[PDB]
Design a protein around this nucleic acid. Structure first.
Ligand SMILES: Nc1ncnc2c1ncn2[C@@H]1O[C@H](CSCC[C@H](N)C(=O)O)[C@@H](O)[C@H]1O
Ligand SMILES: Nc1ccn([C@@H]2O[C@H](COP(=O)(O)OP(=O)(O)O)[C@@H](O)[C@H]2O)c(=O)n1
Ligand SMILES: Nc1ccn([C@@H]2O[C@H](COP(=O)(O)OP(=O)(O)O)[C@@H](O)[C@H]2O)c(=O)n1
Ligand SMILES: [Mn+2]
Ligand SMILES: [Mn+2]
Ligand SMILES: [Mn+2]
Ligand SMILES: [Zn+2]
Ligand SMILES: [Zn+2]
Lengths: 443, 880
RNA sequence: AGUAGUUUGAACAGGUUCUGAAAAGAACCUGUU
């Protein structure tokens, strides 16, 4: 694992485009961190999700790293120059009024990740690199512009387009249970995963469920060898070392989409094919052992690279245009991300008080970026909740085919009718409960 | 290579008129100008912007990208939108615009918008030959588009070479007409490397231009921003047409502004000796600095010193671990200590102290003279001025009071106690007093520091709030001897002054307000002057001096010496950061209040009493606009009004420094701003000519940072209690002087905050719960000896709930004159609460899910803090 | 649907501790102008 010196000097941004299983997380990252410790560089490491952070912590044994992620433990002393956190944590700290260190070196794993905060962080990092104040390494196997859904692997992979079931199945589907090895099944939601894993445990196969709600207990259990199925959401589609044998990827998901169509709103557009990068990353979780040649990938459709109307480009621009630092940096998008029409076209910078309300709405109210920006750009204060009831009669929230009606904190009974509609505020029952709490003044 | 901007220009040059007219406004932001244009046609000269440039400049100003301040130079001012917008900003004291005019170019248009009196637009000037001047803000909006990119490049380079000499460590906003040509980019990168700033695209600009703006308050990569703008403009060609985002136009107000920047003229027959002594002291490093920033002060020299002050805060661990729901409240977590380093002191000086206020008109001066004479005669009806002695000063001075030594012969005492005990100190005092008796001063110099307090800020720092001035301990004794009778005889107490509240106490102020609410009249007004001590003219300094007419000849000599040599001729030492280090500047000023003098509170109260009396005069029709402009105004009418009803008008007011509560006989007082603004007492947080807001409930009137609620107890007794937003209290309790985190060595400070909450803010549910939790999480045998140290009294529990209840009964029942009944309260359950709606309105988090979780599981947090401290003796304060 | 987390002025008021037989003195803390 030889490292070019040029990646440690300022104004240099290094893209590392190795195929999955090449060793970016376990070979190159420890060497880069060791060389950065030797040269005394303030270093930041950015993991997309918590499973990637766990893999980093496993692969960084014996180095002084000040972990700032909930997934990992904490025994930092005070002499660490290396921090580890997530993309969203870094971006929300950049939007916050607390100063962040001037890192001399930034390593970002899975720099293709399309969370709005990840794109905003990429823009900020590339802007800092362009000013000659830092150097960056972006580690990703499926970079922007990827059309290969079947990248190179350590071992050959058998790709078969069967018909993966969505819910539990009374009978049939013998190909599923007849398998002898370990299988990683990707599901689009925790509820579908619950149903599938119940059906799988009904057949005498013990199953581990991975989600953001069950990660803390279940990931370490997955790090054993007992299990036979891992039913998981896309929290583990990047950087997860499962030592599995088969991957089952229906290649379907829900995406937030902004519709102008008169009054602008956000909808969770129905089950669509995942992008090529997501499919390639999901396939890359298997075939990582050069000693096992029988690894299988079972999919149920073709991916789409049509990633243009999705809300995360607009939300990334909204987050990037409101980054607040002592030096007053105005950042720009990462260059391969400037070819997106919705990202490049946004002028979303807010005036000071509106920016503070925007950050408060995202962090305290747990509103989506689009809705928080829409509310803040009207000059509405955080504690003012009248906009949740001032909407047109078409923006009525229904539950059980009945109007959602709430008791405000000032002792009034009102119909939930927000001025701006975000489908992520009333999609799941938990999201609806949280939004009802917010609209009632309890949040 | 062909840049993206050149491709965009080629594409733009080949649009038909229809598609060009659709493209130029596709998706841009745009202000509505129809009403403003109709008004401007009809000759209306108020509230209207003269062009679209006011909104464009406002976009940068509200994003803090440019902060106009001081003197503003507007090159290519055109009609004057930028200059007229900058006139209304509070930090701007003078606007000068230069436009070429003539045929084919816009000429300046006269307007009477807010601050118009400080605007001078000169036509017929070609800025390419105008010599550079010193300015605090420079706004350049020069450049005209041509279809040829090379012509635009040449014009842009010419503008960039013209504006460069004008820039020296100041604010700027400069239009770069054509920023995509490579030579313009290299020039801009060199200019940014030298001066700073950043290129920013304004969303109000049309799509038919590639113009960007070089701003001072920003950083970033110029090439990337230019590329982003080029891609934006190219993408705008093909996407579907969008109606531009209409936003409402800027309202520019109306009325003049009471600002002035005339330089200071030193006396040098009063202050020459002090400056000569100072120069002789630090002769080794004495120099004269031409980069000094002082505009309205006289500058005499500088010498190198080692910087003092700090800008750091320490986190209080016990309070922070027990107030978790407030970790997400910005008003709580953004509290910090004010910046008192030379940088922060210099910023405070530049904003507040380094300003000037215009002279009042002759009628205003005459009214002030009459009112001050009558008020001084009223205040001394039963009291005579008297000399204070060295015995009282020795009895009163704090042991750790700052010596404030300026000259070497004064720097041989470590504490004030040692100095007042010594016999050489009083010999220094005697020689300076002998100089004073001859009308000369030789050693009365003001040290200047910053106030170190808790304030809302960001990035761990808060803006400096004020400047504190103080002389050497001997000079402080001399001014105590001359003028200390005002404080020691209680001249501004409620009994003697009818409107002062000196010696009252915060918790007892609400009763006073309630007593004011029973006087018939209009609403209740409470206005604060913006930077009160910097608005003190020489006129009201003389009016304060007028007290010397009630003294005996020797006391009069001493008081005249203090008033004329030290209060009206002030020599100050102030720190300044320079690239070579830190220097101390010797500056001079004649008119202001030196907050830190012995007569600060009393003379502030006196001047505010007379200002509010004059405002009541104006509100009652005794003073009109013509009376205030009259060099020969009649004294009989003012004297008649005073002798007839001045005491009754004084009884309608509660005065503490510049805080005032006034309940006039009607509401014309709300609009009586002529005399008030002419005396220089410009109100804060409000346009200079907007009528003031009056409260009809005395329980909402803010006074001394608080308002007051009337609680009713179970036994039917009433109780007026102080209250403020809860975030302020919680945030102030969570930080302290120092740096870093602190848990064990600030637990007793947290307990003291809990005791203060239990005593003054017992009516707030969150505050009582948090105080009980903090007390339960602090070892019961520790007693503080400083802010960080403690002693262990193993035989005694410091303050139990019973001790706190006893203190509460003493303060609110036994020692309360306003409660006729005196039955003590036996349990904390009889101590009342605010109503739940009142509690919620004043910032409580009751009714929130995080607050409910915190209250339910509070014992877990108390035990966590207990284990963090260690194995100590703990007592439970939480009610059963 | 999914994912990530808050990182040494002047005037005054009140309280506390120690000394004192009480007065009174000594020290500290918080707050207001
Ligand atoms: N060489 C030059 N010297 C001085 N003024 C010039 C100039 N070249 C152009 N100008 C003036 O600069 C102006 C540019 S437009 C200024 C708009 C202004 N901000 C507002 O809000 O009204 C034009 O009116 C033109 O008259
Ligand atoms: N405990 C582990 C974890 C991973 N590995 C293997 O090490 C290879 C590279 O691991 P990696 O996490 O760095 O993969 P990439 O991040 O480069 O995609 C993979 O083939 C893993 O299967 C292992 O041998 N033992
Ligand atoms: N800590 C303080 C606060 C106020 N003051 C005096 O009280 C005046 C007004 O007080 P303030 O709190 O309203 O502040 P400003 O109005 O001056 O900005 C000040 O100008 C000072 O003269 C003081 O001497 N020490
Ligand atoms: Mn990896
Ligand atoms: Mn004030
Ligand atoms: Mn005030
Ligand atoms: Zn003197
Ligand atoms: Zn209140």
């Amino acid at each position: 694992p030889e490292l070019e010196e040029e990646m440690f000097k300022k104004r240099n941004l290094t893209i590392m485009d190795l195929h999955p299983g090449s060793g970016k997380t376990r070979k190159y990252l420890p060497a880069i961190v060791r060389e950065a410790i030797k040269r005394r560089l303030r270093t930041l490491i950015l993991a997309p999700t918590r499973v990637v952070a766990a893999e980093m912590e496993e692969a960084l044994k014996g180095l002084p790293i000040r972990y700032q992620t909930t997934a990992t433990k904490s025994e930092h002393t005070g002499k660490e120059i290396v921090d580890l956190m997530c993309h969203a944590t870094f971006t929300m700290r950049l939007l916050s009024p607390v100063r962040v260190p001037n890192y001399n070196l930034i390593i970002m794993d899975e720099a293709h990740f399309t969370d709005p905060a990840s794109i905003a962080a990429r823009g900020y990092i590339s802007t800092r690199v362009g000013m000659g104040e830092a150097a960056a390494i972006f580690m990703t196997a499926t970079p922007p512009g990827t059309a290969d859904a079947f990248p190179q692997s350590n071992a050959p992979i058998q790709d078969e387009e069967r018909d993966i079931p969505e819910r539990s199945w009374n009978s049939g589907n013998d190909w599923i249970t007849d398998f002898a090895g370990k299988t990683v099944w990707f599901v689009p939601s925790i509820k579908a995963g619950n149903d599938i894993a119940n059906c799988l445990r009904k057949n005498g196969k013990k199953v581990i469920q991975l989600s953001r709600k069950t990660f803390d207990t279940e990931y370490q259990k997955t790090k054993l060898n007992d299990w036979d199925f891992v039913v998981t959401t896309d929290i583990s589609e990047m950087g997860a070392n499962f030592k599995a044998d088969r991957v089952i990827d229906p290649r379907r998901c829900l995406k937030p989409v902004i519709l102008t169509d008169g009054p602008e709103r956000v909808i969770l557009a129905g089950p669509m094919p995942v992008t090529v990068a997501s499919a390639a990353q999901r396939r890359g979780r298997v075939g990582r052992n050069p000693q096992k040649e029988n690894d299988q990938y079972i999919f149920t459709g073709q991916p789409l690279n049509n990633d243009e109307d999705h809300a995360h480009w607009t939300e990334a621009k909204m987050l990037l245009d409101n980054i607040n630092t002592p030096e007053g940096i105005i950042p720009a998008l990462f260059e391969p991300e400037r070819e997106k029409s919705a990202a490049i076209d946004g002028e979303y910078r807010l005036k000071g008080e509106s920016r503070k309300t925007f950050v408060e709405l995202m962090r305290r109210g747990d509103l989506p970026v689009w809705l928080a920006h829409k509310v803040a750009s009207e000059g509405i204060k955080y504690t003012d909740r009248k906009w949740c009831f001032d909407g047109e009669r078409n923006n009525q929230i229904l539950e059980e085919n009945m109007d959602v009606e709430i008791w405000t904190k000032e002792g009034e009974k009102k119909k939930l009718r927000p001025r701006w509609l975000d489908a992520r505020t009333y999609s799941d029952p938990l999201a609806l409960k949280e939004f009802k709490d917010f609209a009632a003044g309890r949040k | 290579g062909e840049t993206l901007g050149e491709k965009w220009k080629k594409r733009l040059n080949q649009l038909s008129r229809k598609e060009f007219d659709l493209y130029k406004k596709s998706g841009i932001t745009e202000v509505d100008r129809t009403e403003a244009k109709e008004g401007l046609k009809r000759g209306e000269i108020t509230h209207h912007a003269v062009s679209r440039g006011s909104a464009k400049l406002q976009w940068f100003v509200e994003r803090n990208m440019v902060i106009p301040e001081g003197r503003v130079i507007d090159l290519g001012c055109g009609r004057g939108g930028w200059s007229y917008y900058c006139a209304g900003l509070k930090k701007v004291t003078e606007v000068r615009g230069y436009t070429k005019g003539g045929p084919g170019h816009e000429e300046p248009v006269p307007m009477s918008t807010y601050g118009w009196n400080i605007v001078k637009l000169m036509s017929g000037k070609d800025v390419f030959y105008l010599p550079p001047e010193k300015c605090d803000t420079l706004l350049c909006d020069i450049g005209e588009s041509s279809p040829s990119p090379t012509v635009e490049e040449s014009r842009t380079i010419r503008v960039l070479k013209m504006v460069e000499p004008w820039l020296k460590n100041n604010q700027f906003c400069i239009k770069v007409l054509n920023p995509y040509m490579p030579t313009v980019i290299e020039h801009l990168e060199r200019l940014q490397r030298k001066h700073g700033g950043m290129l920013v695209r304004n969303p109000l600009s049309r799509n038919s231009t590639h113009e960007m703006y070089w701003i001072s308050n920003g950083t970033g990569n110029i090439v990337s921003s230019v590329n982003m703008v080029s891609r934006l403009l190219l993408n705008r060609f093909t996407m579907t047409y969008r109606r531009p985002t209409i936003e409402k136009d800027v309202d520019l107000g109306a009325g003049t502004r009471h600002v002035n920047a005339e330089p200071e003229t030193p006396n040098m027959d009063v202050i020459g000796e002090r400056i000569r002594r100072i120069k002789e002291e630090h002769s080794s490093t004495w120099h004269y600095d031409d980069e000094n920033p002082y505009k309205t002060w006289a500058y005499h020299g500088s010498y190198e010193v080692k910087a003092t002050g700090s800008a750091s805060s320490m986190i209080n661990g016990v309070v922070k671990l027990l107030t978790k729901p407030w970790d997400v409240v910005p008003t709580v977590t953004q509290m910090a200590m004010t910046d008192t380093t030379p940088f922060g002191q210099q910023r405070v000086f530049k904003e507040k102290v380094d300003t000037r206020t215009p002279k009042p008109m002759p009628g205003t001066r005459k009214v002030m003279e009459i009112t001050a004479g009558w008020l001084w005669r009223t205040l001394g009806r039963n009291k005579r001025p008297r000399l204070c002695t060295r015995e009282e000063f020795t009895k009163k001075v704090r042991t750790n009071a700052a010596m404030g030594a300026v000259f070497t012969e004064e720097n041989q005492w470590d504490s004030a106690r040692a100095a007042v005990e010594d016999e050489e100190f009083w010999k220094l005092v005697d020689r300076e007093r002998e100089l004073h008796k001859q009308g000369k001063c030789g050693s009365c110099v003001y040290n200047m520091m910053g106030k170190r307090e808790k304030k809302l800020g960001e990035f761990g720092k808060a803006k400096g709030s004020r400047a504190i001035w103080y002389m050497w301990l001997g000079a402080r004794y001399l001014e105590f001897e001359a003028l200390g009778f005002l404080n020691e005889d209680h001249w501004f107490s409620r009994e003697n002054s009818y409107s002062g509240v000196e010696g009252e106490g915060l918790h007892k102020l609400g009763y006073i307000l309630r007593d004011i609410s029973k006087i018939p009249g209009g609403a209740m007004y409470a206005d604060d002057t913006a930077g009160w001590d910097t608005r003190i003219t020489e006129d009201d300094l003389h009016n304060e001096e007028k007290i010397t007419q009630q003294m005996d000849p020797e006391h009069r000599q001493l008081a005249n010496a203090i008033f004329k040599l030290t209060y009206q001729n002030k020599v100050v030492k102030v720190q300044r950061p320079t690239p070579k280090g830190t220097v101390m500047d010797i500056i001079s000023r004649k008119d202001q209040r030196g907050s830190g003098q012995v007569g600060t509170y009393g003379l502030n109260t006196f001047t505010n009493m007379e200002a509010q009396l004059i405002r009541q005069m104006e509100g009652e029709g005794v003073l009109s606009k013509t009376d205030l402009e009259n060099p020969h105004l009649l004294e009989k009418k003012i004297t008649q009004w005073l002798e007839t009803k001045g005491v009754e008008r004084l009884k309608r007011m509660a005065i503490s420094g510049d805080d005032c509560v006034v309940k006039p006989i009607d509401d014309r007082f709300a609009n009586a701003l002529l005399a008030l603004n002419d005396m220089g007492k410009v109100r804060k947080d409000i346009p200079q000519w907007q009528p003031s807001k009056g409260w009809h409930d005395w329980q909402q009137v803010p006074f001394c940072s608080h308002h007051f609620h009337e609680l009713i107890m179970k036994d039917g007794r009433k109780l007026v209690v102080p209250c403020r937003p809860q975030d302020e209290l919680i945030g102030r309790a969570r930080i302290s002087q120092g740096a870093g985190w602190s848990l064990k060595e600030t637990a007793c400070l947290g307990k003291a905050y809990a005791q203060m909450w239990a005593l003054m803010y017992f009516h707030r549910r969150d505050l009582r719960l948090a105080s009980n939790a903090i007390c339960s999480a602090v070892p019961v045998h520790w007693v503080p000896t400083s802010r960080t140290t403690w002693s262990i009294h193993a035989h005694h529990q410091w303050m139990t709930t019973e001790d706190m209840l006893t203190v509460w009964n003493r303060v609110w029942i036994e020692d309360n004159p306003w409660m006729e009944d005196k039955t003590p309260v036996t349990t904390w359950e009889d101590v009342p609460y605010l109503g739940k709606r009142e509690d919620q309105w004043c910032g409580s988090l009751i009714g929130l899910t995080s607050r409910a979780t915190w209250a339910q599981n509070i014992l877990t947090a108390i035990q966590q803090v207990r284990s963090l401290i260690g194995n100590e003796e703990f007592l439970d304060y939480m009610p059963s």
